[model samples]
Target: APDEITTAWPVNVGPLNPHLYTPNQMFAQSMVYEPLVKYQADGSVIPWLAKSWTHSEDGKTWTFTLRDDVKFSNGEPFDAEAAAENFRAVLDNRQRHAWLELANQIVDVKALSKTELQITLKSAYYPFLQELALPRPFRFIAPSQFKNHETMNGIKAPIGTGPWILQESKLNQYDVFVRNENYWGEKPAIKKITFNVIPDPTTRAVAFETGDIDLLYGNEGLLPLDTFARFSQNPAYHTQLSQPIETVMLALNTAKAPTNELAVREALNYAVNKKSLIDNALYGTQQVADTLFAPSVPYANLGLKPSQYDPQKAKALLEKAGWTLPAGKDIREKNGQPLRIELSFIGTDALSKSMAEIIQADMRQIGADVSLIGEEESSIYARQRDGRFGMIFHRTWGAPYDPHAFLSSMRVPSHADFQAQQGLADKPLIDKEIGEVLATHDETQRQALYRDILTRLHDEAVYLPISYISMMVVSKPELGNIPYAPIATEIPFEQIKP
Candidate 1:
């Protein structure tokens, strides 16, 4: 019993490939693969597969010395050549859209020796190290697997140099993993781990309560607050809450008509009460967010505040923008056109639907017509990607350590989904500021540049902040050393013991 653990996973462990986009997929990848560098929970970087590293003075080139005596689960040598090949494969694969940002910046990669590798960048990038430490496709893979084009549907099993070896996978049902006895680092205390896939939250809660599942992963917007409260009170469970890094927000299509107007954008921010939405929908478990970054982030402006809730102020702003309330009509009209907003949300999320209803009522008080649209995840994502909706409830990745990864998304012709959908105009001043942040190695200057960009974004009002999301993990009291890392999907399963 001390060498095994079972947990309920809310999403399906689709293909055991490392190149997939979903967060749940990391459950398998992290067990199989390892990154060159590891991002610790305290926002610091440490050598993992790599023993040491050095970059050029201009920050254009980097050299990494790999760890010796490392081998994949399949018994293949993990060396510099294997590392270079993995990077090349990710860059060459057209289907690997998630890694395009990092891929596009690479000028070249070469293996200098059996244990040393060199990487050249197209330009000076301060966050390149952090990019290499990302949990997914950037992780090391066996060279033999890539040579044979082994992938999601092509391969039968995953092979990597991590602590666990995948013993069996049953599609949408469950996955079984056994410890890799030849693992390079400290062997996992638990020899076997079973991830039971259960899509329904209610069923997951029942399984955790009845001792059917020993642990449950709590993703923001997925775990029900009511269930968490009940489990936290029980002495049989051990609960841990991570610092807030994930940000939930309303993404307005700035390329469209009504939201494109500055006055209209500011008015919508004032109409809805963020505190009320958090209390009713989230059980007052999270913090209200004003700007894009939370207070914990590196460059968060504590003095910046969100627009206050005032219906009268919202009506005045709309009227100044040429929208007038006609006699016997609640909705305002401008030049014979009604002020109507198409708001969309994921149909599967009951909380999102409830929040949308509250927002709809608030907007109506200011004579703004609001239409709520509920669709499945795929449909809503597609509409948001193509800029088809006026406003949509969405969650954004919060970069507490590297702001460039988050801010660069706002640039056009970029890989970030929300920024591409917003279709922001080209602003040379903002571009220059972002470039300065990336090129300057000086900490103080880089931070000041980030503040300039954030202040400009606040003035523009393209994105409306809702709340700072908090992540949690619930486990049986017997489990020990449950690791916590910000903005990461994989926990340190090797350290978790009974």
Candidate 2:
């Protein structure tokens, strides 16, 4: 029997540290951590570590009944005390970037008994359950590992009440996880899972074809479209496509001089042809996104349409904004300063690099000098967090479960949030609507508030929504039980079999 399944992950499966902010870190850590509540394949919330949970009438307090049978891989009991400790650790850890928003809303966590736990929120938050199901730092960690809570990097290994236990990890190369024989739930059929770090899409495809890897994930825009299609037609492989809930966009630094102008921001939107990017760069694999929310998300504004591509209109808007082209120069200038933008993207992401180039060509036609900067992932995030870049190609996943998840981050100035970096004039109003959306349980009221927010974003020209992600997973025919879920972040790997 085949006992191991080797898979290719696009990025270096960096430290399995759950406290890290990067998506790669979260993706790797999710394999070993178990959230209190789990998101089902159908997007419904179900108990995972917690047997059940109930919220108070005002929704300010929540009580959870822990599963007494569960235990961490390190032989630690999974009880109320352990749950409360994990919550406290997340709230106290400065590096808890993934759950900082959820942490701030938590007033306190109390362990009433060995199996009962209570969490008090600052206000009546309707998406509290959804927040708990976030596939990252919010999940429970072993109390023994809590000692290294100051900097999770100090912890060499991760232990959790999950189906798999980390056996070894080679940074920038590969990670090996063995099935947790003492797992409380039904164990994974595959005894071991090896994640091979193959940054290049072509190389990954080669590996998959040669039988070096059993499975591959291509939906994060890393796999070449041709390769995905090639694998789909092969009867030896099982192909699956999930409805995309991710929003890929270009974040314009409103704090910068040129992009700071409303006219310039609007011009940038009209300059780029979204459909062309999807067709040429994405190979028609994605849907052109006019708004932030994907169609699968609740309250999506189907009426919102992408601005038509019109270089002439863009030039007019730029001229109106005081950026006029000189007699012989192609780039526009205002007050002796050239309209030069530093557009940055992850140097490792093939899709973003291609999209950045396409955007650069389109912007040049509109008389803007767009210099593409391909920086390392860490450096790109650092620059974004400090608002040092003119613009950056970024992808965000939210909506459906928690529509305000991405928007709420803008309330804090330090985070590399689109609205926060843009310094939108209507931020106060935007934050107000976001708060109302979080507090209101009624879907109709929330949709109305979301409509207003989306309208304001469109009017203010905050960020350009490029595409709605279509996640594709291609694996060898031998692999089984790879459940197709809408939320890529919450994929239940434990259920995956071979």
Report the number of the highest-TM-score candidate. Answer: 1
User: What are the TM-scores, per candidate, against the unseen true structure?
Assistant: 0.92, 0.91
Clashes of each: 0, 0
lDDT of 1 by residue, 95-193 (tens): 454323456678788899989999998787777777777766677777676546534334345678999888987877888889999999999889998
Model 1 TM-score, all chains together: 0.92
Clashing pairs in 1: none
Global lDDT scores for all candidate models: 0.75, 0.76
The number of the candidate with the highest lDDT is 2
Model 2, 1-498: lDDT tens digits are 486888877666565555555634655577788888876555567888989988899889899998999988988899999888877766676435532356667889989999999999988877677778776667876777754544344444577788888888777788888989999999877898888988788888789889898887656565788677777788888877666768888888877888888899889989999999888898777888776666556566458766778888899999988999899999999999999989988887787889999999999999999998998888987887788778887677643233567766665655566432456877778878877887787888888988888778777777787988866787878776477544466555666756
Residue pairs whose backbone atoms clash in candidate 2: none
For candidate 2, the 10 contiguous residues with the lowest summed lDDT are 147-156
